[PDB]
C-alpha cells in the first residue's frame, strides 16, 4: 500500500524460502550465496526441507553474544543449487530503535502476509521461552504462532527476524551486518 510494504515485498519475493524442520514450518531469510537465517528454536539438523525439497545442511551455527548469551539466530549454509540475491548492504551495522516497521511472513499457513507493526524498541534482554536472550527488538502487535522467522524491515533496512510474542507484544532478534562478513 506504500513504500514500507514495497520494500518488504521486494525482500519476500527474492530473499525468502519456506523452511521445514521437525519443529515446524518457518519463514527463512536468504542473506547471500547459500547462507540463510532462521530462529534457533527451529532446531536445524543435518537435513532441512526448503520449499518442500530435501536439502543437506552444510553448516549451522546458533549465535551467542560474547557474554555467551543466546541471540536466537541460527545461520545456515544450504546445499542448494542457486544463490540468494546479496542483501547484506540492507543490514544495520549497530543496535538501534526504528520507526514504521513491517513484519512479513510467507508459509503454507500464512502466504503473502504483511503486518504494519509501527515503532520498534531496542528492548535488549528478554526471557524468551525460559531462555535469557539479548539484542531483542519489540513491537506492540499481537503476533501469533506461525509468524516465527518473519522478516522485520523498514524502508531500505532488514532489521530482524520474529522469534516470539506474549499476546500483546512481538519480539524479533536483531540482524547486524557483522554476523555475515566473509
Q: Kindly write down the DSSP assignment for every residue of 57-108, as one continuous string.
A: EEEEEEEE-TT--EEEEEEEEE--SSPBP--GGGS-SS---EEEEEEEE-SS
- End residue of a domain, out of 63, 84, 105: 84
What the block records as the C-alpha cell of 159 is 532489521
Q: Which DSSP helix (H) or strand (E) runs through 180?
A: none
Nearest Cα to 16, choosing from 144, 152, 138, 141? 152
Distance (Å, rounded) from C-alpha 42 to C-alpha 156?
27
For residues 102 and 35, membership in a common domain is answered with no
Structural domains in the chain (count): 2
Beta bridge pairs of residue 84: 33
For residues 94 and 109, membership in a common domain is answered with yes
Query: Looking at the annotation, which residues are catalytic?
Result: 41, 72, 148
How was this one solved? X-ray
Domain of 44 in residue numbering reads as: 16-84
Resolution in A: 1.5
What the block records as the C-alpha cell of 64 is 551467542
- End residue of a domain, out of 33, 52, 84: 84
Distance (Å, rounded) from C-alpha 25 to C-alpha 106?
10
Distance (Å, rounded) from C-alpha 174 to C-alpha 157?
12
Amino acid at each position: 500500500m506504500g513504500p514500507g510494504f514495497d520494500f518488504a515485498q521486494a525482500i519476500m519475493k527474492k530473499n525468502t524460502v519456506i523452511a521445514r524442520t521437525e519443529k515446524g514450518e518457518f519463514t527463512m531469510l536468504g542473506v547471500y550465496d547459500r547462507v540463510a537465517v532462521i530462529p534457533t528454536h527451529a532446531s536445524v539438523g543435518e537435513i532441512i526441507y526448503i520449499n518442500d525439497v530435501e536439502t543437506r545442511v552444510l553448516d549451522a551455527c546458533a549465535l551467542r553474544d560474547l557474554t555467551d548469551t543466546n541471540l536466537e539466530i541460527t545461520i545456515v549454509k544450504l546445499d542448494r543449487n542457486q544463490k540468494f540475491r546479496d542483501i547484506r548492504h540492507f543490514l544495520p551495522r549497530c543496535e538501534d530503535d526504528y520507526n514504521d516497521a513491517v513484519l512479513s511472513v510467507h508459509t503454507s499457513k500464512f502466504p503473502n502476509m504483511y503486518i504494519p507493526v509501527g515503532q520498534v524498541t531496542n528492548y535488549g534482554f528478554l526471557n524468551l521461552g525460559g531462555t535469557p536472550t539479548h539484542r531483542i527488538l519489540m513491537y506492540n502487535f499481537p503476533t501469533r504462532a506461525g509468524q516465527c522467522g518473519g522478516v522485520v524491515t523498514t524502508t531500505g533496512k532488514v532489521i530482524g527476524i520474529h522469534v516470539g510474542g506474549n499476546g500483546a507484544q512481538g519480539f524479533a532478534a536483531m540482524l547486524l551486518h557483522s554476523y555475515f562478513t566473509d
